[PDB]
C-alpha cells in the first residue's frame, strides 16, 4: 500500500490539479488596453529524497532509523517539486484570444516514510550490514 502510494497516486494527485492561472488582460476596460499578463503557476514532475534530517546550525544528515529512534526524530524524507509574458490580446471585439516559471524544483515539505519501503534504507541491506546498522534482522 505504501509503495503504491509513493510510486503512483502522488504524481497523479499532483497532476490532476497542477494548474493555477491569473492571466491578466485588463480585468476592466482600459488600461489602454492592456495586454494579457499570463501569471500562471503549474506543477510538473515531483521528486522524493531519502530520509534526510537537519538540525539547528547543522548539516542535513542522511538519517538512520535507530538514530531517529534514540533522538526522537521523525523518519521523514523531503519532497520537492518543479514549478512552471507570451500572451494573446483582446480589445472589445473580437475576442477568444485573451490568453510564470522563473525557477525550478521548489521545496514543498517532508513526509514520514515507512520502514522497509522502496525508499527506506533498510530494504537494501545485507544481514551483515543490517547488523552493522544495529537493528534486528
Amino acid at each position: 500500500s505504501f509503495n503504491q502510494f509513493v510510486d503512483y497516486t502522488l504524481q497523479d494527485i499532483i497532476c490532476e490539479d497542477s494548474t493555477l492561472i491569473l492571466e491578466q488582460l485588463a480585468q476592466h476596460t482600459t488600461e489602454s488596453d492592456n495586454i494579457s499578463r499570463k501569471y500562471e503557476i503549474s506543477f510538473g514532475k515531483i521528486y522524493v529524497t531519502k530520509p534526510m534530517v537537519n538540525e539547528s546550525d547543522g548539516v542535513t544528515h542522511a538519517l538512520y532509523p535507530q538514530e531517529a529512534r534514540l533522538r526522537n526524530l521523525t523518519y521523514s524524507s523531503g519532497l520537492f517539486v518543479d514549478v512552471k509574458t507570451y500572451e494573446a490580446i483582446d480589445v472589445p471585439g473580437r475576442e477568444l484570444k485573451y490568453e510564470d516559471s522563473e525557477s525550478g524544483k521548489v521545496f514543498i515539505g517532508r513526509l514520514p516514510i515507512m520502514l522497509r519501503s522502496k525508499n527506506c534504507y533498510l530494504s537494501e541491506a545485507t544481514e551483515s550490514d543490517l547488523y552493522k546498522l544495529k537493528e534486528c534482522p
Binding site: 521523514s76 514543498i108 515539505g109
Partner: protein, 49 residues
C-alpha cells in the same frame, strides 16, 4: 513565489506529523468528521504479539 511555499511546507509536514502522532484523522482544527484509533502505538511485548 518562494517565501510562502516554505510555510506551506510547514503546514503539510505539520499536518501529517500531527495526524500520525495523534490518531485523529483530520487537520489541526479539533478533529471534525474524524476517527480516533487510527494510529496506535506499536505493541512490542513479544514477537508474536
Amino acid at each position: 513565489f518562494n517565501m510562502k511555499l516554505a510555510i506551506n511546507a510547514k503546514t503539510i509536514t505539520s499536518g501529517l506529523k500531527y495526524a500520525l502522532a495523534t490518531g485523529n484523522w483530520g487537520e489541526q482544527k479539533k478533529a471534525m468528521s474524524s476517527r480516533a484509533g487510527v494510529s496506535q502505538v506499536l505493541n512490542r511485548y513479544t514477537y508474536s504479539s
